[model samples]
Target chain A: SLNMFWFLPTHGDGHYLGTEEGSRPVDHGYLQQIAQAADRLGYTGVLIPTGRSCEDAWLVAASMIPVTQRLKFLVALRPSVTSPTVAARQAATLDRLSNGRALFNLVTGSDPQELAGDGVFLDHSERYEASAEFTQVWRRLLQRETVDFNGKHIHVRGAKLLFPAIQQPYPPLYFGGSSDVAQELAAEQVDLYLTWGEPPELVKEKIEQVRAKAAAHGRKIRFGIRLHVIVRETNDEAWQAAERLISHLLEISPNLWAGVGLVRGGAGTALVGDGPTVAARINEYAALGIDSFVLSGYPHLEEAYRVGELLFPLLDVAIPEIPQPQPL
Target chain B: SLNMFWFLPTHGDGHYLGTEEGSRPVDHGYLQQIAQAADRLGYTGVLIPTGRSCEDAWLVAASMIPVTQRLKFLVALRPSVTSPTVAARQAATLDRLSNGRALFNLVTGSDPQELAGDGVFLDHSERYEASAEFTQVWRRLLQRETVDFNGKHIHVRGAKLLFPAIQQPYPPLYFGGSSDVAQELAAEQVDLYLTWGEPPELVKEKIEQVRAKAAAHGRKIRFGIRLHVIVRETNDEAWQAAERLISHLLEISPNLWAGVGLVRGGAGTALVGDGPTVAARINEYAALGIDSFVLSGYPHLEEAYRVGELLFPLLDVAIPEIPQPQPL
Candidate 1:
């Protein structure tokens, strides 16, 4: 079954990009609106992005745990910024409190200047290497192990979780990136490998690459896609909305517009069409074995309503429940 | 008006002090129950305690932000554990999101063994010294200053908060300890000086000490107390309940049982009596100029109801409404 998740605009949101004309401040209340909308609208969860520009995802997502039941928080788990032990404790706390509704989106690399501000000066490959070791110790600690790992990039002593998370091993680990190191790390570490809304053909190739890599590691993995959607009543209306948000954009696919990628680093492409056409684009990704969808739009709160009303009826979207796996 | 607050037992709570017989696991849902109960119970906010043994106060309190309408979060701000810039960012995020409902409870010192595991080995006086610097940089960052402070114990370079907390300077800083350094720090830094419930005369003297010290610093500070209570319908019944909670006890004052302190470190004294007697006891403390009361009871959920229904009607309690002074 395909899972659907919305995005929380911790970086701020508005009707348009690059200007404040259609924008509103991303406050706690606005985040609540988006999260509650996703909760009742049958989306699986909301992904709170991580970076220096955005609010801390752990706190932002925790703020939503009680406000919206059944909407999982796929919050960022940055290895560079926090201790694995601390991260494990937070994940356990959130998962136990949220009744297993917390998921982790690992971020091994971020803006260099921001990373330095966080006192993390690790280069790209070293960051990934650190995150790999971080998760190794993180997973072990959550499983109630006293981790004394001495890796080149990460190390800890007498680290373990005193509390238990509802999810046995830990919250489902999800990761996204476009680098070779990212793919290698995902193959060994994460439960799900997420890719941006590239062309269907590119997604297929990417999935195969990660799949073969995981196979060589004697592991199994799930695949997901992150895309934005602009669903409208008519095709022309959707096209107009797309042009309004981003003019002179490259058409990544028949209905997938790459205009959003002009500014953001990940999940740059979006589906722009009437309900049926947008649903069809999502189905295309689904046919390529995409089982989870992390989606967003400008002014996220309003778009959740539109997509829930017009698109969910046409797609195989899964609401949320938590019976994943137990860690030993 | 006097401010009333309750406590969130992130450290796990039960009816019995050291046994799990009447204890339930501390989970996210239970914390919500406590916060929502305090929200309507005329208590101002809930304090989430910090340490390594418990769930993080930041995440737990953030989880309560939307579920409870007006309850403030007096979360811990530990200088030894987290960076000042990170703390400032989280404070701004929570304060902005909660619309000025966030408060900072500064924890300058905690368990030495746990601090070692967290990679902090700072002793008592050094921890207090570092926290002073932590808050100095923390407040300056929130005020949008590019701070490059080189303090004796703590140092940060080019630190500033990009987002604005609704509380102007920052959330109100709160501190608790039974040391001279705590008193001095409270005089210079905090908005309120907090003490675990002690003898009335002792509390009066404590208040005067802090007041005079703050006056010396050219600042003014409010006073508050933390106490556990066992409110029953009759005096005998309340005493019996206290005895049940603690078989051996010391009567610190009239009807104030000191049994809870034998097992715990802070706020061991509790008011155990009929409604008027307990009300009279609290009023006596209030008369001594206690403007804030942080109270808790065993089996926190049910006791919140009991306190709200039975005790609040008899005492001069303040239901919450947030319009505190803005940070400069």
Candidate 2:
């Protein structure tokens, strides 16, 4: 079964780019609407972006716990900005609070400018090293192991979490990075390896590289892909939207439009088409071992319904048989 | 009017101190029940504790935001455990998610062993120095100012908050510490200075000292006191129950029992009596310019109801006229 995740636009969301015409200010009401829509639409979780430009991911994710049932929060764990001990406790608390619906995304942000603004001046590889060290301590603490670690980038003595997460060892760690060190770190540390928008051909090599390394370390890992989508009434109308929406794209493959890369920082390409057209495209990626899909689109709340309604039943997506919400 | 805040036992809660009998394991269902009760029972806010022994305060408070309306969270801002920049963004996000119903409690953990466990080995005065630096950066960033602060104990180059909190300046900062340096820091930088269960005469001297120092810095800070409570149907029975409960002793003045100090770290005294007796005691504290009270009782969830029902109508609590919960 496939796992399907949605995206929360913590930065901002709207109908079109470069205008406030249909823009929705990121607020409690708007975010809750998106989360509730995803819950009803059969998403396993939601990816909350993290950076100086976006709202804090942990708090934003946590605020959703009370309103939605079983909608896991795939929030960021920024090593440079938080203490590992503090981070572990938060993960434990959220797991307990949400009945174990918590996931982690290791975010060693790419841009140096943004990293510096966050008081992290570590270079690319150094940032990954710090993230690795942070995770070592975090994972140990969450699993009830006492850690007295002294790494090049991080050091802590007699560190332990008093309360362990309800999710046994901890929540699954998901990470996406294109760099060499990033892939190696993911292979060594994470449970799920992720990729930005990539076609099957390119994704094949990346997965092979990570899988070989993970196998060397006696591990079997899951894989996921993050992509935006544009499903319309017809293939013709969706193609037009591809041009009009992002003028701002690469038509790398048949339906994958690259224009989103111009306006967005990551997960650039979008599957452009009607319901059947897009579902067919997703099948191609699934054939290549991408079991989880982290997805989003412009005007996030509305697009959630469109994509879920079209793609959910079309694919063998994972839907846990928990108690469903019903009105009186 | 009084600002009555309840205590959130993120550490653990029970009827008795030493045993697991009648104890509730900390979990989502229990915490939400207390938060919803506080929202309906006229509490101005809740003070979520911060320490290695307790669950992460920020995440716990954030989890409550969606469940309650208008009940503020006085969550901890731990200086040693989080980057000031990340902390400011979380504060901003919580304030926005809760529509300005967020308050900050600066927690500089007094236990050296616990601080060391969190990888912070800063000594007494040095911890205060770091906390001051943390708040300076936090305050400036939340006000939309780009800060390049390089202090004795902290440094952050070019840190800023992209999304300011809904509260224009920032949420009010509440702090409690006994050392001279702690008092000095509170006088220079906090919105509210707090004490750990002191009688009126002793509280007067502390308040006068803080008030004079704050005035010297051109500020007038409010004051708060934290204490446990034992409310009974009869004043005589309450006094008897106090002895039987804590065995667990201290009766410094009338109903202010001192035994809790032996078992708990802070707020050593308990306000023991019937509704009128406790209310009268609160009046004395209020007369001495103490505008806020942080109160708690054993088995926190049940105690919230007991205290609210018996004391709410008898006191001038700051309950904003918000929409009440309606049942079908």
Candidate 3:
């Protein structure tokens, strides 16, 4: 059966719809409230994102472990920034501790400038290449007693783990990007492949393209969608909420829009619509064999709940259980 | 009436340890098994460390949570590398989800190369400066409605939280450092001042220095010590264990020796001794009014159990409890 997850703005979300402004920032309470609300609404997980633009995902996810129960955390990271050995160990440990609630959303971050800022400093395509190698090494480290690998991207003399993870094998890997490099890598390795929530036909085509590549490698793959969500009790209510959120945003800056456009040359598509429209699109994509959905919205907390509560039950699936606080 | 904990050793142990390099890498299964052993033996918490030399602390700690029931985790972190608002959030979340079983070890790393490796690249004093500012912001964000701070290191216009932490006011901040810069920072900001295991006189003097510094800042503090234990049923067995461990490095290569020196300058002291000797040292430090002791020994899994079994009943304290797992 398919699963559904929401997004937590590791970046501060606001009354406004766009990016964080000035020094006025958003804090944990907002994220926690939304996370708890989402958990109650039967969302399977919440994606804590990574980027130069947001707070650290490690800290955010660690903090949330207490606030919500049963709701898994899809932690997004770029392999270029960290050692695979360390990353693998960390993921295994988290899986053991969180009762198997850790989900990895791997991103070979697309922005070269930002990657450089973090000292990762690889070009987008090369970053994906490194990611593919890193993930391979990580998977081996998590599962095998001894991992001796020398990829063109990563070289480890002889890396073996002493601590066998309590969770057998390793945590599931969810990778996303639209470049040809990303598709090829995903088809070869990633357990769950993701794309931005575009329209149904385009998503179907993308799905087919990735499936075909994976099938060439004699592999099967699960699919996921990432986009903003705005849901409410009804379609009209959801639209009103969306409009209210849009009202909070300043007119989209041309510079930001232009910057976004430059990155769209031959990559994935975007999804920008209200509830039923988005849900309808999601259903259509699910029909195309998409198995997971990762959704987000601006002013992250409010939008997370609106859509999480609205979409979960309507999807006609068995809802996941929520984790609750217990006395120590 | 004091609590003593042990380090999880998820990352960099001593140069002679060679545990991180072996077939199993981190040995999470061993950790889970050890944590379960510790829960029954009387340890209060297990410390999970973080640094460039080790795996991610969050994941390691998270994975261990399910293995134990009431035993708390002393999760170590370096602050300058992460946003304060997010750290605060993570602590709260972990505390809540783990049933108030999460604690933190506040550290501001100094190794410029290591810091740079993590993309935190701040110079010596500046890193501490950022840490101080981050802690200040975190404190305000955790306790107050809106944290409005404009500092030399960090600038936040007016940031407030919607959800307060479970550890009301804030989580206990335990920090230790021997350097002047670190000492000053810990004196002013940390709730509890920590010191490495040292002679009674030296610990007393260090405590006095920190107390004077805290007085200057209009604060009072608790204190703790971190040491490596060699506990056994009798003194002879303990001493033998220590000797055997030390024997593994009878011939330290130039490379390993250099690595040892590189880290020793950063961490002023490390503990290694027999059961009675280690206990005497603990008493000596405790005489200085330090109530907490965080100790670890070689081959963490075996050592933790030996220490925990002896220490708990001898000290007349309750052992941390782990969740009872499903029957095999």
Top candidate when judged by lDDT against the true structure: 2
- Residue range A1-328, candidate 1, lDDT tens digits: 6799999988888777666676687777778888999998999988898776788788998888767768899998787667777778888888877778889998876454566554456777778788888888888888888777676976566676778787767789998876787898889878999888898888899999999888889999999899988899999998899888864337868998888887755468889899888888898889988899998987798999998999999987786764433331
- Cα deviation of A142 in candidate 1 (Å)? 1.1
Tens digit of per-residue lDDT, candidate 2, span B165-206: 877688888888767878887888889998887788888899
TM-score of each: 0.91, 0.96, 0.60
* Ranking 1 against 2 by lDDT, winner: 2
Question: Candidate 2 DockQ category?
Answer: medium
Task: Encode model 3's per-residue lDDT on B37-140: one tens digit a residue.
Answer: 66666778777776644556765665454446777888787777665655665666566545567788888755435443333446777888888898878777
DockQ winner between candidates 2 and 3: 2
DockQ-based CAPRI category assigned to the predicted complex of candidate 1: acceptable
Model 2 stretches with alpha carbons more than 4 Å out: A247-249, A323-328, B247-249, B323-328
Model 2 residue A226 CA deviation in Å: 0.4
Q: Which of candidates 1 and 3 reaches a greater TM-score?
A: 1
Among all windows of 10 consecutive residues in model 2 chain A, the one with the lowest summed lDDT is A319-328
Which numbered prediction scores highest in DockQ against the true structure? Answer: 2
**Which runs in model 3 stand beyond 4 Å of their true positions?**
A1-73, A76-223, A226-328, B12-25, B250-278, B316-328
